[PDB]
Design an enzyme around this catalytic site. Structure first.
Site, PDB file in Angstrom:
ATOM      1  N   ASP A 127      -5.305  13.829 -12.911  1.00  0.00           N
ATOM      2  CA  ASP A 127      -4.694  12.629 -12.708  1.00  0.00           C
ATOM      3  C   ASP A 127      -5.521  11.700 -12.043  1.00  0.00           C
ATOM      4  OD1 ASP A 127      -2.997  10.456 -13.236  1.00  0.00           O
ATOM      5  OD2 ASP A 127      -0.965  11.603 -12.706  1.00  0.00           O
ATOM      6  N   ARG A 131      -4.498   4.611  -8.192  1.00  0.00           N
ATOM      7  CA  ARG A 131      -3.372   4.973  -7.512  1.00  0.00           C
ATOM      8  C   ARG A 131      -3.322   6.519  -6.677  1.00  0.00           C
ATOM      9  NH1 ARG A 131      -2.416   5.583 -12.902  1.00  0.00           N
ATOM     10  NH2 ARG A 131      -2.372   7.718 -13.718  1.00  0.00           N
ATOM     11  N   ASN A 132      -4.202   7.398  -7.214  1.00  0.00           N
ATOM     12  CA  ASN A 132      -4.375   8.645  -6.729  1.00  0.00           C
ATOM     13  C   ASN A 132      -5.701   8.670  -5.817  1.00  0.00           C
ATOM     14  OD1 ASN A 132      -2.070   9.777  -7.451  1.00  0.00           O
ATOM     15  ND2 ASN A 132      -2.563   9.919  -9.638  1.00  0.00           N
ATOM     16  N   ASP A 145      -4.457  14.251  -4.056  1.00  0.00           N
ATOM     17  CA  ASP A 145      -3.434  14.729  -5.125  1.00  0.00           C
ATOM     18  C   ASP A 145      -4.150  15.572  -6.234  1.00  0.00           C
ATOM     19  OD1 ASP A 145      -1.238  14.788  -3.464  1.00  0.00           O
ATOM     20  OD2 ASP A 145      -1.182  12.609  -3.663  1.00  0.00           O
TER      21      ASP A 145
HETATM   22  C1  LIG Z   1       0.491  10.179  -1.936  1.00  0.00           C
HETATM   23  C2  LIG Z   1       1.945   9.446  -1.450  1.00  0.00           C
HETATM   24  C3  LIG Z   1       2.806   9.579  -2.401  1.00  0.00           C
HETATM   25  N1  LIG Z   1       2.645   9.819  -3.673  1.00  0.00           N
HETATM   26  C4  LIG Z   1       2.375  11.490  -3.879  1.00  0.00           C
HETATM   27  O1  LIG Z   1       2.870  12.160  -3.172  1.00  0.00           O
HETATM   28  C5  LIG Z   1       2.107  12.190  -5.061  1.00  0.00           C
HETATM   29  C6  LIG Z   1       2.589  13.200  -5.568  1.00  0.00           C
HETATM   30  C7  LIG Z   1       2.190  13.926  -6.915  1.00  0.00           C
HETATM   31  C8  LIG Z   1       1.174  13.085  -7.856  1.00  0.00           C
HETATM   32  C9  LIG Z   1       0.907  13.605  -9.092  1.00  0.00           C
HETATM   33  C10 LIG Z   1       1.276  15.140  -9.341  1.00  0.00           C
HETATM   34  C11 LIG Z   1       1.319  12.755 -10.239  1.00  0.00           C
HETATM   35  C12 LIG Z   1      -0.722  13.679  -9.298  1.00  0.00           C
HETATM   36  C13 LIG Z   1       0.715  11.852  -7.184  1.00  0.00           C
HETATM   37  C14 LIG Z   1       1.100  11.380  -6.232  1.00  0.00           C
HETATM   38  C15 LIG Z   1       4.068   8.632  -2.405  1.00  0.00           C
HETATM   39  C16 LIG Z   1       4.290   8.110  -1.117  1.00  0.00           C
HETATM   40  C17 LIG Z   1       3.117   8.064  -0.107  1.00  0.00           C
HETATM   41  C18 LIG Z   1       1.987   8.870  -0.300  1.00  0.00           C
HETATM   42  C19 LIG Z   1       0.661   8.818   0.699  1.00  0.00           C
HETATM   43  C20 LIG Z   1       0.598   7.805   1.731  1.00  0.00           C
HETATM   44  C21 LIG Z   1      -0.266   7.653   2.495  1.00  0.00           C
HETATM   45  N2  LIG Z   1      -0.511   6.516   3.591  1.00  0.00           N
HETATM   46  C22 LIG Z   1      -0.218   5.241   3.552  1.00  0.00           C
HETATM   47  C23 LIG Z   1      -0.504   4.547   4.531  1.00  0.00           C
HETATM   48  C24 LIG Z   1       0.192   3.014   4.543  1.00  0.00           C
HETATM   49  C25 LIG Z   1       1.019   2.616   3.773  1.00  0.00           C
HETATM   50  C26 LIG Z   1       1.312   1.231   3.652  1.00  0.00           C
HETATM   51  O2  LIG Z   1       2.723   1.000   3.667  1.00  0.00           O
HETATM   52  N3  LIG Z   1       0.721   0.122   3.960  1.00  0.00           N
HETATM   53  C27 LIG Z   1      -0.793   0.126   4.022  1.00  0.00           C
HETATM   54  C28 LIG Z   1      -1.556  -0.718   4.826  1.00  0.00           C
HETATM   55  O3  LIG Z   1      -1.231  -2.186   4.975  1.00  0.00           O
HETATM   56  C29 LIG Z   1       0.172  -2.238   4.929  1.00  0.00           C
HETATM   57  C30 LIG Z   1       0.979  -1.421   3.958  1.00  0.00           C
HETATM   58  C31 LIG Z   1       1.345   3.545   2.557  1.00  0.00           C
HETATM   59  N4  LIG Z   1       0.612   4.743   2.412  1.00  0.00           N
HETATM   60  C32 LIG Z   1      -0.931   8.734   2.992  1.00  0.00           C
HETATM   61  O4  LIG Z   1      -1.899   8.720   3.899  1.00  0.00           O
HETATM   62  N5  LIG Z   1      -0.777   9.819   1.980  1.00  0.00           N
HETATM   63  C33 LIG Z   1      -1.933  11.062   2.470  1.00  0.00           C
HETATM   64  C34 LIG Z   1       0.206   9.873   1.317  1.00  0.00           C
END
Ligand SMILES: Cc1c(NC(=O)c2ccc(C(C)(C)C)cc2)cccc1-c1cc(Nc2ccc(C(=O)N3CCOCC3)cn2)c(=O)n(C)c1
Length: 264
Positions: A127, A131-132, A145
């Protein structure tokens, strides 16, 4: 690596993904981590646990590392590297007007280095998409991921006619036969390059998933984004050969990207 959940300090909500809630926290009060709290029923857990050591041993500067798991509890946790700037797709859209084309190419190199490493371990992402990929505090892009799509329990994501299946990142042999391979990651990487050079536009916007499948099966391809040179477009286009064995490897793609950088 079975992490002791007593060593985790939860600090902030990061939102929800395919396995539920993800939080920002610290490990032993020092290291920034993300903690996936795996929603009950969202994951083939016994399958993931039985097979997870390979994913933790994937170690590369351009992968968002899977540090360990917490499985002596419900829900189980997946602990990963933290990336302060979030996902690449949103980062592209938020900083759209500031990127130089050299920075876009550097993003492609980052991802290509990660994927060459995965290719060398015969490990499929399945995937790959903007987005990933995630972005750290210094603008380094890392692939996230990898491999986890295999454990998703969600018919809308696992079916190629489901609304969550990554149709717009899929080659014809995935859409028709569910034939995942190194070459289906290659196809997705081409689409990811297109996402980077379009500064985060949706591929095949205004096409539905089934219209996208129908038209890429007939040879429709994404147009050249304005910021992509012809050399860059030739690289991303090479990922979209109808026949999988005509597509490059990530080793070749990386050499192609470095040659452009050197010519630049
Ligand atoms: C990764 C992720 C998810 N998806 C998933 O688990 C997920 C699960 C399964 C899949 C498949 C099986 C379909 C492939 C895909 C994705 C959901 C939710 C979160 C994160 C996430 C956010 C981070 N980091 C930040 C850092 C900052 C901000 C933010 O709010 N801002 C950025 C700066 O400017 C201001 C606003 C946001 N996320 C960060 O490091 N990891 C390791 C993780």
């Amino acid at each position: 690596w079975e992490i002791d959940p007593k060593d985790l300090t939860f600090l902030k909500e990061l939102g929800t993904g395919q396995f539920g809630v993800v939080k920002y926290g610290k490990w032993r009060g020092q290291y920034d981590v993300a903690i996936k709290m795996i929603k009950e029923g969202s994951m083939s857990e016994d399958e993931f646990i039985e097979e997870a050591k390979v994913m933790m041993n994937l170690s590369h500067e351009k992968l968002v590392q899977l540090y360990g798991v917490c499985t002596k509890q419900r829900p189980i946790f997946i602990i990963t590297e933290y990336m302060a700037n979030g996902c690449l797709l949103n980062y592209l859209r938020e900083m759209r007007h500031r990127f130089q084309t050299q920075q876009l190419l550097e993003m492609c190199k980052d991802v290509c280095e990660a994927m060459e490493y995965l290719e060398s371990k015969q490990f499929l992402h399945r995937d790959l998409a903007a987005r990933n990929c995630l972005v750290n505090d210094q603008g380094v892009v890392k692939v996230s991921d990898f491999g986890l799509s295999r454990y998703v329990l969600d018919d809308e994501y696992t079916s190629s006619v489901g609304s969550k299946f990554p149709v717009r990142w899929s080659p014809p042999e995935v859409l028709m036969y569910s034939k995942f391979s190194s070459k289906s990651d290659i196809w997705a990487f081409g689409v990811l390059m297109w996402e980077i050079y379009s500064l985060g536009k949706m591929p095949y916007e205004r096409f539905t998933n089934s219209e996208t499948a129908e038209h890429i099966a007939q040879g429709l391809r994404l147009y050249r984004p304005h910021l992509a040179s012809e050399k860059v477009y030739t690289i991303m286009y090479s990922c979209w050969h109808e026949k999988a064995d005509e597509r490059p490897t990530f080793k070749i793609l990386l050499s192609n990207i470095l040659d452009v950088m050197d010519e630049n």
